[PDB]
Design a protein around this ligand. Structure first.
Ligand SMILES: CC/C(C)=C1\OC(=O)[C@H](C)[C@H](O)[C@H](Cc2cccnc2)NC(=O)[C@@H](NC(=O)c2ncccc2O)[C@@H](C)OC1=O
Ligand SMILES: CC/C(C)=C1\OC(=O)[C@H](C)[C@H](O)[C@H](Cc2cccnc2)NC(=O)[C@@H](NC(=O)c2ncccc2O)[C@@H](C)OC1=O
Ligand SMILES: CC/C(C)=C1\OC(=O)[C@H](C)[C@H](O)[C@H](Cc2cccnc2)NC(=O)[C@@H](NC(=O)c2ncccc2O)[C@@H](C)OC1=O
Ligand SMILES: CC/C(C)=C1\OC(=O)[C@H](C)[C@H](O)[C@H](Cc2cccnc2)NC(=O)[C@@H](NC(=O)c2ncccc2O)[C@@H](C)OC1=O
Lengths: 251, 267, 254, 252
């Protein structure tokens, strides 16, 4: 097993088609012991986490709640063991209200909404790292999810701003994580099926030399599992691109 | 002149040593008609803008105030003329509370403080563009101030995050500005010795912080092939005035680096 | 004048349509004293340089010839004056044989041809800087021409590789140029005017769509003006960098 | 095994301390069947490759020789089997004469020498891909070695130019490799008046890297190459994976 005898925290599992669900599914197949995180509808989330190959304890974590943080170390240790520590952390949380992304114009999004998105998508990565680093083993790995924000695109708008902030946050999380001997990295994925949206998706498969399947979330789930393993021990504060190679191609 | 017969809005002038003051000073020397922006101390700021080569009207703007942004364009047109429009916009506003940058650890900054910084440093650029684009001429230019956030560095911490957000905002401001035929660009400057920067060197933030900022400034002059003067704010001012002119008409959503070439050098 | 009382060396002025010809035209309008260089057909090049607003001395410069590069500076000083020096240098010589770019597959280009392309497009920038830096004034400027090579595209093939090399060369030229107080920068332009015919069309159409301020493939004056801005004293803190005159297309996905 | 039942071509093995040597060693430990490449001094390479955990056939490949590149595809097939194909390709070839890198000034390197370096370090990657792609399986991987050329540094001079060219070549190799369903990627490694600048670079690298950097250890970069040769990075192409301890993402 690629992740044999590793304790990994996986956050933001809501559906069975999610990359977050597949990361957990692939990790369990590779011999990893998981601890899962639920945002709000925990009863709804428990029905989905039961489709997973092995049993994993579900913990309540509202990334915006301060009390949920700090208690997000004690609650983890009680689930795994008194002397046992975490070997991996998967941050699969990303949100932006519709005012900030979609049909709504860039200028028409109010700050309160874009602030909510930066908190949940970018700040929360530093928050999760602050709470989980004291209970992490040397050689550990924190993985976040990104969508290449280096260039502006239609509809994505303020979520591109939240992603740019995440990239900067990850570089600083790596500095704090390095003193624990833990790696911090981001996984930039291509479009995942969760008029303009069709144009962006079609463009990706054309640009990607090996092509891109918007319906398949296992190639990105495997990329996260490669970063959670000891096969990338010299990679930190970096972005690993699982987009079929589209970002390196103009046409 | 380089900016002859151009109407430019210059924001965030608080001192006489500021890059924002030196933009306005160089612009007036190049034949530009200015409109200046104030935060809270209106009488105190107007008394700092009297040191400028030519006369320029002052206007109240609190980027956090929605009324101040909605009253804009109208208050600008009344200052310049009924049929006259703006040719340039200078966004020289950047803030982050000390919890987010300095000696305070990255993890110890609360969200409310870092949210205040992103609002004032990154979001405000889109807000100023939203309010001023309808009263801007085709071939116009919106200029913002940046500090290279592509790599993490000590003390900067969350201001680096706010700067990364500004870079992304600038790319989207360019899309909206393009519809008016207006350019939107950022100027990435090297370290500038402000009043706060003179204090953190003097030991106001401690011996640990006083070494970090020194190590950064010394390293910048070494990396820059043409060198870098932390005390001189005119080479960055001139770079902004090149972007406000018609000599860079095919540059949009981009970052122009006035750091002595340090960002392209490892050692 | 933006370039008033400045002595600038301009290279690669073969045709009247060239950005190199426009750079010289705009520079002369801004009060600059030029020194021009030709590749081989100096008789035909002199009939082209006669269409420039002001008079400028012609010089023979085969950038592949070592004797021609060693002969530079002396030949330049004799044209301008014994005590006078150069304030600007515009490198506008980019080449790649058709085996390296176009319809011909990437793998089918022989090394001898791509080597010729790297020599003329990338290495020559360092060579021109080596020869002209001792006769350049502090606050001077060396400007090169680029086309964004950060992402692979059809037809450009090995010329994209030669451009990537030029970007790296520019960063090292800046180190040597800094010692003289001279700046070194590149200008990345947008596209300038059946299978190949469709590819280039798809690229040009896409560029005007991506560019928020739009892009005119027929107009070479916005890129010429960008070079002139870099030749002036209005960008004195910019070195080893790439200034993008592409309408903002490189910062836009769609 | 991470590379179980995979046939991988490993080029440029000259010493028992090389990353190329450690890539081959780690791959054999992960269950991979190797085919090795030797430049000229075959008696020296055979001695070094004997120290490897398992047996692997040695093939002669002067990457500058056209006949060697044209006959390579068949010579690999004869070593593995008449019906078998390659699953991985490791390009561990990088050279630049001392005129192009070291104490010698940037301007003083003649073109003939820098041309030799671009041929061996950047062009050869496209040449090796041209020769080996027809005998490669879908889901395959071509891996090259890089040293971050995005910023200029002392001494590395013209080799930084050859590396920038490799990065551009890699993006185009990905286009050709994609047609075969093969991935093409580069691994940017950290360091593995002369001494006064190399020391200042190595010391600075361990300081910048948040997890630190060991200039004496070549196994973390060898493991990174083996991760790219596996099926755990199937959506990565024309990209650069950085095994430098995270130094490239840090200013100080
Ligand atoms: C076209 C504008 C909209 C309305 C969205 O954007 C997309 O669908 C884009 C084109 C992409 O398909 C991305 C692909 C993706 C998926 C997961 C993580 N990073 C990127 N989706 C999200 O960012 C989506 N991200 C996540 O839900 C997310 N999930 C796990 C971890 C981090 C996340 O940002 C979401 C915010 O975006 C959208 O639904
Ligand atoms: C980590 C050390 C501290 C304590 C600071 O950061 C600095 O002093 C950095 C190293 C630089 O000196 C920069 C220089 C600079 C100044 C204005 C625009 N771009 C760059 N300062 C600011 O960005 C400073 N901001 C501005 O003054 C600013 N002014 C006009 C427009 C945008 C700005 O961010 C501010 C963040 O600097 C600091 O207080
Ligand atoms: C792939 C299609 C072909 C067949 C060519 O490429 C183009 O037309 C590309 C897509 C662009 O239109 C660029 C636009 C350009 C032109 C001059 C300087 N920077 C950018 N052309 C060259 O690079 C062209 N270069 C120059 O003329 C050039 N001129 C002065 C200095 C350096 C140069 O590369 C040349 C390589 O372009 C082509 O022949
Ligand atoms: C200090 C200045 C000199 C004189 C050299 O540069 C170094 O030793 C630098 C600082 C690094 O140690 C790098 C690290 C490295 C090692 C292998 C592949 N990419 C990067 N070595 C080379 O590039 C070295 N290249 C390789 O060993 C190499 N090996 C396999 C595949 C590609 C390569 O370039 C070589 C060019 O470096 C040097 O001889």
């Amino acid at each position: 097993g690629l992740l044999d005898g590793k304790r990994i925290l996986v956050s933001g599992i809501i559906t069975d088609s999610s990359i977050a669900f597949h990361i957990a599914r692939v990790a369990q197949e590779q011999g990893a012991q998981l601890v899962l995180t639920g945002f709000d509808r925990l009863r709804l989330i428990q029905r989905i986490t039961d489709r997973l190959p092995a049993k994993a304890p579900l913990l309540e974590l509202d990334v915006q709640n301060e009390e949920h943080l700090a208690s997000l170390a004690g609650r983890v240790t009680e689930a795994i063991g008194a002397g046992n520590k975490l070997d991996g952390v998967v941050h699969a949380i990303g949100f932006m209200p519709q005012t900030g992304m979609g049909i709504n114009p860039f200028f028409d999004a109010p700050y309160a909404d874009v602030s909510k998105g930066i908190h949940i998508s970018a700040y929360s990565y530093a928050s999760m790292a602050k709470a989980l680093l004291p209970i992490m083993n040397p050689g550990g790995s924190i993985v976040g999810m990104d969508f290449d924000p280096s260039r502006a695109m239609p509809a994505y708008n303020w979520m591109t701003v939240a992603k740019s902030a995440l990239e900067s946050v990850n570089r600083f999380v790596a500095r704090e994580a390095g003193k624990y001997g833990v790696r911090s990295n981001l996984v930039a994925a291509g479009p995942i099926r969760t008029a303009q949206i069709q144009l962006l998706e079609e463009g990706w498969d054309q640009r990607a030399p090996i092509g891109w399947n918007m319906k398949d979330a296992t190639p990105v789930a495997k990329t996260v599992c490669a970063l959670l393993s000891d096969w990338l021990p010299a990679t930190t504060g970096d972005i690993i691109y699982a987009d079929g190679g589209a970002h390196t191609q103009l046409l």
